[PDB]
Design a protein around this ligand. Structure first.
Ligand code: SF4
Ligand code: SF4
Ligand code: SF4
Ligand code: SF4
Ligand code: SF4
Ligand code: SF4
Ligand code: FES
Ligand SMILES: [Ca+2]
Ligand SMILES: [Mn+2]
Ligand SMILES: [Mn+2]
Ligand SMILES: [Mn+2]
Ligand SMILES: [Mn+2]
Ligand SMILES: [Mn+2]
Ligand SMILES: [Mn+2]
Lengths: 127, 754, 154, 196, 377, 145
């Protein structure tokens, strides 16, 4: 639907919280990868808000404790994902109309995100 | 042998053969991801599938050809629609979660995954062809992350072969890499952050894609753009075949060149990541002293200025001192220049008190085939690759059969996670040496004490328990081999007893000489004469230097000519005529192995500036001394060596020598032989080739030395700053200094300045 | 007719131009694929790692050095063809004669889209204080030269 | 049909017959029988002699009878009297140590310029040619360019700051006898062909 | 008395008197050495090296080569590509011919007719610039088919020129047919006995100018000429007068191939979609890993045709032409022998002008229509 | 004298003089030869224009052609093969006609459009007027001798 555009809109903001929490708790924010559908888009049109497809919150060693990604514009079943690398925990945020960003039934607010990132930081970050 | 029929071709082949080797042996082919020369084969990628017939009774399922043995009268089909459809499918399962980086990825045109996809994938079913079936969200993870200052990890590109983790466990034996989660979620990772072992660069050449890449050379050029120069690595006695990759005069990256006789397809980290300095800062013109300082001079102005300092010289006051890595030709001329020009003192940078030529050389081959391994010294640090032949020797592995395509792709003989035999070897070292693990009979002595341990082994004294179990082991030994390096070869006492033990029992030796071309320079007669003036003893009055000697040998002399490649501070202050010289990377000629094998050096297109090889510089300084030299260039020099009758490339040259010039030991400090050489402390190898000071935690803190402090230290070989380490295995009241040169295994005075 | 501008077709093979996206990022990712397909060995490429704070392109790889020998170049458009990003696209300039061999090796800064004039044209128009006058006109710009403002009155 | 009478004849007489599925066919004659046997070919109706192509096989992955070989293209013009349009190639391997091979000058006049190019570029000598003189390669040029072991004679191309390129060290393209940039080559990059 | 007269060809004309004893030609002056340097390039890369020999009717080299390869690895040329390849081929034929014709309109003093021949050619070349972006050496033919589709403006513009040529060619035939001076200039001179041209291999379409009915597009049909309405011009006794005319007739039969092919032009593909032979569609390079791998691999190290030897003969504005390609299973061709129509064509020049006058011996060569690029290569 | 307002203001007059009495003498080789006969058709000699791949056999010839010329003289090089060795890097072709003759101006193209070769001589034109500098900033000598 047009959800796709509002989901990408929500990808920007999740990224926004990442950069915030990052500067805030003074932990490396690392752009992990750009959309190949931008790099290799040629004369073709591109209206997406960012060019960053995989982000992360890494520690001092650079090993990440939080990984984030959304699926490209040309792939099916678009979801935005959150993974705690090393702790086996994966999340799948969709986008509902009126409700907003959900992990199924529970809304994914800044607050709830910050909670996860903290839990992760304290537990996982090697240095 | 057994009869196999591949497709339409029948072949002979020994019993144990992998069907994969038998397939390639008939001159065919098959996708091949997870298997690697010299590693345990396992069918994990599931690429090498064939169809197998065995009575024609086609087996119902497809076989992993890489872990299937061959039976007598067996048929192997690698072309059927059943095969090829399966292949193209397996190529698709691989590329399924892969990233899409090919243009940006440094694994360019040298990437097995790329080549195999364009070879066996996108299957022709019998208009518009379908390139990709999978239309979901590919796997997204951690990217461009360095494991060490030498190795950078892309996890998204990893295809889960086991090439790397397998290797760490099997070859050097340092389990510092493994997979993590499971399912589609698994990945490579570490917990031993540095990437500990000194053989961690090898995973770089194996990884079938660009997950594990050489950071020393990140983003320089695409693989095809590199001109490749095959040569030998002269940083030590083993002399591993290497490839030097260069674009526009500068040195980009070092890789391993297969040469199974010696090192197989393995390089050591110093061998591979210490190239930073050979292209970075260098002396490009000949220098000469004018007003208490040096200034630019042509080779013309410098040939005269060299005629000056030597016009007032008698031919017996002349010194000829080469570096440790001088060529077999550079040592022959110097022998003749010093012969005609009758002098007693001509020597080489690394020369050992006791000549390595004393003993009969043993082939690495012999080492695998030997029964017992008596070792005094640390192979890891002296002759690093010996670490890796002992890893094979310990596992009981023996020299594979040779197929049409050479070394096997799938040696069934190598099992993964093989048991290691602790009864097969014995190690004796001034510390807890690495391979002391794979040795039952092990004992930590203190510096220059081998002299006594060796006496014990002969059978004329009483050594510790270990040294008794060890005597008895070499006793019952059927065809053992002796390996020894620093103190043994630097100390006439030990070294003499050494050669005796191994004379009585008909066993060969591996002398881990601190001089690279040691066995060969000695073979050329580049040994000092009766007089005595050695590479460290300030003796002669006018001399040639192929290096930077102890400050003690310069100070005094009337005329000095240093033929360096870089400009040392000790030269810009005590030198009269300095001449640009080429590195071993940009040289040409031959060397001789710690096993007596003669290896070739080829010349890389690196920035030499106005440099000329010592073969030329020597001929030029022979004129300014009277006699016209017999050597000009390489072509003609080749005749002189072929005259003395030294075997062609790869052949072994037998040459014994009984004579030894001892010298006393001021035992305060020990020059711990290390792998990294001191002139490699550039850039990234910056931190790994720094020096170190080791002492027992009591004596350590007794002489005011915290566990992590940057101490300055002075020796006959120079002032070096150094990190200080506590080690409960260092003998009390001695200090171990990182002998980052060819002056390792020496005992000397010196102290800690404050 | 150095008085009336010559009309060339919109497809013409002129001085190579490197393009940017709207974002302003350079399209080039220093893959050196264009150089690899060049039958005349006339392209030299040195790659570089983007600066996260201050980016040049989109990936983790941009073109540190990008050099084409205009003497060696035959003008196939093979390079424009091999490109994955739409970076190197032959444009319209042809008035690019000169005196010293090594002056004719154009650089990245001679080819960016923003640039207007060939090396000799702009240089002369330097010591003269007079704007560059191109000698061509085209019915329109290819879609592939998106940005390359040029004389298109038709 | 003048061609079948060649084939029906070579079959009985032990001449190998080469055939690719694309539309060309060969017949490889020994050294001796070549001279006369070819004269017989013209008498048989073989009007026009298209080309003569010299071949150096030194760096060829599969082994062949001898290093050098020459191929001829005999035809019967369809635009004349009783021309069929029967065309075909005849091959003669020629020893590396003996670049000797008789001329067809007696028979076809095309063989004039065509044999001198095969002599100029490959070192192959033709017994009885009016004058075996170099054709295309400069007078003082020594050797024979078109044969494998004679250098293409390339020069590095030059760029701005010591940045050069050596083509012989740059070519990504593989060359038959080359194992490639990975360990080995197999599959569709050992030679590939579609199935119409 | 031996005079040394020497386009970029040199001639050792031995001559006592005013006749001509023997002309001994010397070539090698444009010897670029394509046949060696081509053993060192991709199959795709060689498409830039073919147009550079016969730079006049260059497209025939393009096609001759693409043909021998396509056969070799077995590629299917899309209907639309096959069509565009004959229009393009013959549109290039007229370019070469227009030139030969033009060089003739000056030996003959006709000047406004020439100033037109030049304008025609320029209008043919602009068409090339329209679709290929170049005047010549167009990198347009591909092993699959063609580089890209043709622009919208191309049809309408080809129509203009295809509209004024019909009677245009006739006008030229006329000036030479009603040969005021031309008769006394070319009629007798340059004797080409039908049965000696077939001995020296003067395939040159100035072969049929001496009564031989051999055009390869007819005898050994190739790119679908097999299916075109096709008149092969002929000449009575092989003089230069007829040679000049034959070539003018060939211009109509070209113009008719053009009109005929232009009809059967329907929208579609333009090169063989086989992934092994043809780089992936441009747009999915942002989506398929396979595409990227294929694309990357394609443009670096090319594709690998099977071990084998091939030859397909084609017809140019100068006679038999065709590449003899020995493949060794590599990214580049093991041997590339090019049949130069212009090289064999010249062995028939000593006989051509023997015993004849001398100032005539210019037109006696111009009539053999040689291009040095072809002879020397 | 040589460096005096008078002298100098003559040699600047003389230069501007034969800056317009330039008499091109084309030297066609391959493909480039024909693309110049489209600029000659649109409108003792100084200024030889080398137009095409210069063979090694052909080289000593163009040598004499050049030597046996008047003296205030200039060379233009037409397209890739004359300028560099072109795409043709091998035993049979000279890799820059400047190996044999002083090139005054170089014109890229393969072959260069006719209208670009016009620009090429407007360059060598403004160069014998001595009004031309390289990319370093240096003033360039009108004739290469
Ligand atoms: S590892 Fe191989 S397949 Fe993957 S991006 Fe790199 S070159 Fe391409
Ligand atoms: S990092 Fe490379 S070698 Fe290791 S498992 Fe992954 S693909 Fe194999
Ligand atoms: S073990 Fe020695 S010869 Fe081998 S790579 Fe290391 S330093 Fe070089
Ligand atoms: S147009 Fe052709 S010759 Fe010029 S740089 Fe591009 S690929 Fe090379
Ligand atoms: S112009 Fe295109 S092909 Fe060339 S380096 Fe840049 S992205 Fe790669
Ligand atoms: S530069 Fe190009 S157009 Fe000119 S002669 Fe060379 S190949 Fe022909
Ligand atoms: S299963 Fe990976 S190669 Fe045999
Ligand atoms: Ca990281
Ligand atoms: Mn898109
Ligand atoms: Mn990073
Ligand atoms: Mn370097
Ligand atoms: Mn010869
Ligand atoms: Mn009439
Ligand atoms: Mn006659």
């Amino acid at each position: 639907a047009s959800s796709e555009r509002e989901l990408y809109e929500a990808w920007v903001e999740l990224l926004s919280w990442m950069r915030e929490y990052a500067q805030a708790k003074g932990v490396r924010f690392e752009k992990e990868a750009d959309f190949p559908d931008f790099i290799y888009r040629m004369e073709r049109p591109y209206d997406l808000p960012t060019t960053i497809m995989t982000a992360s919150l890494s520690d001092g060693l650079g090993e990440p404790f939080l990984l984030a990604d959304v699926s490209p514009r040309h792939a099916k079943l678009k979801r935005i994902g959150l993974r705690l690398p090393r702790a086996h925990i994966h999340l799948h945020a969709h986008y509902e109309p009126g409700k907003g960003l959900v992990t199924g039934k529970i809304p994914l607010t800044k607050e709830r995100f910050f909670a996860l990132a903290d839990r992760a930081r304290e537990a996982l970050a090697f240095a | 042998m057994v009869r196999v029929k591949v497709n339409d071709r029948i072949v002979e082949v020994p019993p144990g053969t992998s069907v994969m080797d038998a397939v390639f042996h008939a001159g065919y082919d098959v996708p091949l991801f997870c298997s690697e020369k010299h590693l345990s084969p396992i069918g994990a990628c599931r690429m090498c599938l064939v169809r197998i017939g065995l009575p024609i009774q086609w087996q119902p399922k497809l076989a992993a050809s890489c872990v299937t043995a061959v039976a007598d009268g067996m048929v192997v089909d690698t072309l059927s629609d059943v095969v090829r459809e399966a292949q193209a499918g397996m190529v698709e399962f691989t590329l399924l979660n892969h990233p899409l980086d090919c243009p940006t990825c440094d694994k360019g045109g040298a990437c097995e995954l790329q080549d195999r996809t364009v070879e066996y994938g996108l299957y022709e079913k019998y208009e518009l062809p379908v390139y990709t079936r999978f239309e979901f969200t590919r796997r997204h993870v951690d990217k461009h992350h360095p494991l060490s200052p030498f190795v950078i990890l892309d996890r998204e590109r990893c295809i889960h072969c086991k090439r790397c983790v397998r290797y760490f466990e099997e070859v050097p034996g340092d389990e510092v890499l493994d997979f993590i989660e499971r399912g589609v979620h698994t990945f490579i990772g570490t917990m031993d952050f540095g990437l500990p072992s000194g053989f961690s660069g090898n995973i770089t050449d194996i990884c079938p894609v660009g997950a594990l890449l050489d950071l020393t050379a990140r983003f320089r050029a695409r693989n095809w753009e590199m001109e490749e120069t095959p040569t030998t690595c002269a940083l030590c006695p083993v002399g591993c075949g290497i490839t030097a990759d260069t674009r526009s005069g500068e040195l980009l990256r070092i890789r391993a060149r297969e040469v199974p006789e010696v090192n197989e397809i393995w390089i050591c980290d110093a061998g591979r990541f210490g190239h930073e300095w050979a292209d970075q800062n260098r002396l490009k013109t000949p220098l000469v002293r004018k007003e208490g300082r040096l200034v630019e001079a042509t080779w013309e102005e410098a040939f005269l200025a060299l005629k000056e300092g030597l016009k007032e010289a008698r031919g017996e006051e002349v010194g000829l001192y080469l570096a440790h890595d001088a060529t077999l030709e550079e040592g022959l001329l110097a022998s003749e220049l010093a012969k005609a020009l009758k002098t007693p003192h001509l020597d080489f940078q690394g020369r050992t008190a006791a000549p390595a030529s004393l003993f009969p050389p043993a082939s690495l081959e012999d080492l695998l085939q030997a029964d017992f391994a008596l070792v005094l010294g640390d192979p890891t640090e002296e002759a690093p690759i010996l670490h890796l032949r002992l890893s094979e020797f310990v596992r009981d592995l023996k020299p594979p059969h040779r197929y049409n395509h050479g070394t096997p792709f799938a040696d069934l003989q190598i099992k993964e996670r093989m048991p290691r035999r602790t009864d097969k070897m014995a190690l004796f070292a001034p510390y807890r040496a690495p391979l002391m693990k794979w040795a039952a009979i092990h004992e930590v002595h203190r510096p220059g004490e081998e002299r006594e341990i060796l006496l014990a082994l002969l059978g004329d004294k009483e050594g510790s328990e270990m040294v008794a179990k060890a005597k008895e082991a070499w006793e019952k030994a059927k065809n053992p081999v002796l390996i020894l390096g620093a103190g043994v070869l630097q100390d006439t006492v030990a070294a003499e007893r050494a050669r005796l033990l191994a004379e009585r029992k008909g066993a060969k030796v591996l002398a881990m000489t601190p001089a690279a071309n040691a066995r060969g320079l000695e073979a050329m007669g580049v040994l000092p004469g009766a007089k005595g003036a050695s590479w460290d003893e300030p003796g002669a009055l006018y001399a040639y230097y192929g290096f930077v000697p102890p400050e003690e040998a310069l100070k005094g002399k009337r005329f000095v000519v240093m033929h360096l490649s870089h400009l040392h501070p000790l030269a810009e202050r005590y030198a009269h005529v300095v001449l640009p010289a080429p590195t071993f990377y940009e040289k040409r000629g031959h060397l001789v192995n710690l096993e007596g094998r003669v290896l070739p050096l080829s010349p890389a297109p690196i920035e030499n500036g106005e440099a000329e090889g010592a073969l030329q510089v020597l001929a030029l300084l022979a004129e300014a001394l009277g006699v016209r030299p017999p050597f000009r260039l390489h072509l003609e020099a080749q005749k002189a060596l072929k005259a003395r009758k030294v075997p062609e490339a790869m052949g072994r040259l037998s040459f014994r020598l009984k004579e030894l010039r001892p010298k006393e030991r001021k035992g305060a400090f020990y020059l711990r032989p290390t792998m990294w050489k001191a002139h490699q402390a550039v850039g990234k190898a910056q931190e790994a080739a720094r020096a170190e000071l080791w002492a027992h935690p009591e004596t350590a803190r007794a002489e005011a030395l915290p566990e992590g402090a940057q101490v300055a230290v002075e020796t006959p070989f120079g002032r070096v700053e150094a990190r200080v380490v506590h080690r409960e295995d260092v003998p009390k009241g001695h200090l171990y200094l990182s002998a980052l040169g060819p002056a390792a295994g020496l005992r000397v005075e010196g102290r800690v300045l404050v | 007719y150095p008085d009336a501008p010559v009309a060339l077709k919109p497809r013409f093979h002129g001085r190579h131009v490197l393009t940017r996206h709207p974002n302003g990022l350079e399209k080039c990712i220093g893959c050196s694929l264009c150089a690899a397909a060049c039958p005349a060995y006339a392209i030299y490429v040195e790659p570089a790692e983007n600066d996260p704070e201050n980016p040049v392109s989109a990936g983790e790889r941009y073109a540190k050095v990008y050099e084409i020998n205009m003497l060696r170049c035959i003008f196939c458009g093979l390079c424009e063809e091999a490109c994955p990003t739409g970076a190197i696209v032959l444009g319209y300039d042809f008035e690019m004669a000169d005196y010293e061999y090594s002056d004719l090796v154009y650089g990245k800064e001679d080819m960016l889209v923003d640039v207007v004039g060939t090396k000799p044209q702009r240089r002369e128009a330097k010591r003269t204080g007079k704007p560059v006058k191109v000698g061509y006109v085209v019915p329109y710009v290819r879609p592939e030269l998106e940005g390359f403002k040029a004389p298109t009155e038709g | 049909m003048r061609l079948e009478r060649v084939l029906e004849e070579a079959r009985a007489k032990g001449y190998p017959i080469e055939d690719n599925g694309l539309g060309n066919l060969w017949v490889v004659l020994p050294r001796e029988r070549f001279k006369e046997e070819m004269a017989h070919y013209k008498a048989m109706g073989f009007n026009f002699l298209a080309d003569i192509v010299g071949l150096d096989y030194l760096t060829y992955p599969d082994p062949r009878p001898e290093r050098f070989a020459v191929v001829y293209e005999l035809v019967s013009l369809p635009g004349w009297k009783d021309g069929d349009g029967s065309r075909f190639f005849v091959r003669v391997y020629v020893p590396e140590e003996d670049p000797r091979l008789p001329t067809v000058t007696d028979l076809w006049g095309s063989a004039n310029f065509l044999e001198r190019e095969v002599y100029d570029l490959f070192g192959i000598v033709f017994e009885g040619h009016p004058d075996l003189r170099k054709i295309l390669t400069p007078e003082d040029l020594e050797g024979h360019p078109l044969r494998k072991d004679y250098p293409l004679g390339e020069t590095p191309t030059l760029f701005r700051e010591g940045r050069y390129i050596i083509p012989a060290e740059f070519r990504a393209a593989l060359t038959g006898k080359d194992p490639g940039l990975t360990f080995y080559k197999g599959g569709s990059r050992k030679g590939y062909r579609s199935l119409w | 008395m031996t005079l040394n007269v020497g386009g970029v060809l040199r001639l050792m004309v031995t001559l006592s008197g005013e006749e001509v004893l023997e002309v001994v030609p010397h070539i090698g002056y444009l010897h670029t050495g394509f046949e060696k340097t081509m053993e060192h390039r991709t199959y795709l890369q060689n498409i830039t090296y073919t147009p550079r020999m016969d730079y006049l009717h260059s497209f025939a080299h393009d096609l001759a080569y693409a043909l021998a390869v396509e056969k070799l690895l077995g590629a299917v040329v899309p209907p639309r590509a096959e069509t565009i390849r004959v229009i393009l081929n013959e549109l290039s034929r007229l370019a070469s011919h227009l030139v030969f014709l033009g060089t003739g309109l000056l030996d003959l003093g006709a000047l406004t007719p020439f100033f037109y021949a030049f304008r025609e050619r320029e209008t043919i070349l602009d068409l090339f610039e329209w679709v290929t972006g170049q005047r010549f050496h167009h990198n347009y033919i591909r092993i699959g088919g063609v580089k890209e589709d043709l622009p919208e403006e191309f049809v309408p513009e080809l129509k203009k020129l295809l509209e004024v040529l019909p009677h245009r060619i006739d006008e030229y035939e006329a000036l030479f047919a009603e040969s005021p001076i031309f008769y006394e200039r070319a009629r007798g001179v340059g004797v080409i006995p039908p049965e000696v041209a077939i001995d020296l291999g003067l395939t040159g379409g100035s072969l049929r100018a001496s009564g031989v009915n051999y055009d390869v597009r007819k005898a050994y049909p190739y790119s679908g000429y097999e299916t075109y309405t096709f008149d092969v011009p002929l000449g009575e006794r092989g003089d230069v007068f007829d040679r000049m005319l034959v070539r003018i007739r060939e211009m109509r039969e070209s113009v008719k191939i053009i009109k005929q092919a232009l009809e059967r032009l329907e929208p579609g593909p333009v090169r063989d979609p086989n992934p092994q032979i043809t780089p992936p569609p441009r747009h999915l390079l942002e989506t398929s890993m396979e595409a990227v791998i294929y694309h990357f691999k394609h443009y670096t190290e090319g594709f690998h045709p099977p071990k084998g030897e091939v030859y397909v003969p084609t017809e140019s504005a100068r006679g038999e032409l065709g590449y003899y390609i020995v493949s060794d299973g590599g990214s580049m061709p093991y041997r590339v022998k090019v049949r130069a129509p212009s090289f064999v064509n010249l062995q028939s020049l000593p006989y051509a002008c023997k015993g004849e006058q001398v100032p005539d011996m210019v037109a006696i060569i111009a009539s053999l229509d040689p291009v040095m690029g072809d002879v020397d290569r | 004298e040589r460096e005096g307002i008078l002298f100098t203001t003559l040699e600047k007059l003389v230069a501007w003089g034969r800056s317009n009495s330039l008499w091109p003498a084309t030297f066609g080789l391959a493909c480039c030869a024909i693309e110049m006969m489209a600029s000659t058709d649109a409108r003792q000699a100084d200024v030889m224009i080398v137009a095409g791949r210069l063979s090694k056999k052909m080289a000593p010839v163009m040598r004499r052609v050049w030597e046996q010329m008047p003296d205030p003289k200039w060379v233009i090089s037409m397209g890739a093969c004359a300028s560099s060795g072109g795409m043709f890097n091998n035993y049979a072709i000279v890799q820059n006609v400047d190996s044999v003759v002083p090139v005054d101006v170089y014109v890229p193209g393969c072959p260069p459009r006719p209208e670009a070769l016009i620009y090429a001589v407007m360059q060598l034109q403004k160069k014998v007027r001595g009004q031309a500098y390289n990319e370093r900033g240096e003033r360039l000598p009108p004739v290469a001798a």
